[PDB]
């Protein structure tokens, strides 16, 4: 078991709704992947996580609360993203 991938929705510019997207949890980071290309648009250390929050419709990460550390998206499988993340911070800690 290695890097994990989750199709999540994100709030982009140009409209007001969310845009399907693709997340990638790495035992060293978290990233916003372009479901379109599968390439990474964003990255964020997993060992940098402060506290996250998976939901039945969405999931969220809290890293940077100093200012704005809250990065979230829409996904009907958070506990899957979160348990792993949670399980990954368990490693890299």
């Amino acid at each position: 078991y290695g890097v994990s991938f989750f199709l999540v929705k994100e709030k982009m510019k140009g409209k007001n709704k969310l845009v399907p997207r693709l997340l990638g949890i790495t035992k060293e980071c978290v990233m916003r992947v372009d479901e379109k290309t599968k390439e990474v648009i964003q990255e964020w250390s997993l060992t940098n996580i402060k506290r996250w929050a998976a939901s039945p419709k969405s999931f969220t990460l809290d890293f940077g609360d100093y200012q704005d550390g809250y990065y979230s998206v829409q996904t009907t499988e958070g506990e899957q993203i979160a348990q792993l993340i949670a399980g990954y911070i368990d490693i890299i800690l």
Binding site: E10, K11, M12, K13, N16, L18, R51, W52, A53, S55, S58, T60, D62, Y70, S72, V73
Partner: peptide, 24 residues
């Protein structure tokens, strides 16, 4: 330390549906 986190992040998530997003 768990307690409200869920609601503490969900309340924040509301800001992702409001209208802004990331304010770049």
């Amino acid at each position: 330390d768990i307690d409200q986190m869920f609601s503490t992040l969900l309340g924040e998530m509301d800001l992702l549906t409001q209208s802004l997003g990331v304010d770049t």
